[PDB]
């Protein structure tokens, strides 16, 4: 139960969800940009974007804003799962081609 990995930044969070800043430690542009792309491919998301506040801190604030349908937490979970599925597909294709050649 890692409670220090991803945090909800309450000052930058709206009422009834739909807008939230998540602080993810030990992450950088690698996860940030892929997560932003996947989340932006979600039709309910109106605003996705991450910032690394300082290069001296292993930190990542990712801002998700949605319309009234779903919440930013829901969108973030969906984006993470969709990145998982993307990596599954890439793994399967790469393994198949490496086997075939």
């Amino acid at each position: 139960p890692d409670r220090e990995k991803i945090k909800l930044l309450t000052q930058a969070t709206s009422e009834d969800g739909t807008s939230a800043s998540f602080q993810i430690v030990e992450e950088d542009h690698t996860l940030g940009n892929a997560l932003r792309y996947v989340i932006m491919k979600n039709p309910d998301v109106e605003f996705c974007g991450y910032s690394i506040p300082h290069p001296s801190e292993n930190l990542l604030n990712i801002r998700i804003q949605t319309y009234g349908e779903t919440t930013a937490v829901d969108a973030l979970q969906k984006g993470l799962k969709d990145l998982m599925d993307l990596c599954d597909v890439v793994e399967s294709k790469f393994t198949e081609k490496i086997k075939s050649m």
Partner: peptide, 17 residues
């Protein structure tokens, strides 16, 4: 080449230290 190594081998190094 053209042979999988990840399927057979347990990726111990990919665990978080």
């Amino acid at each position: 080449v053209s042979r999988d190594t990840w399927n057979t081998k347990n990726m111990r190094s990919l665990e978080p230290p």
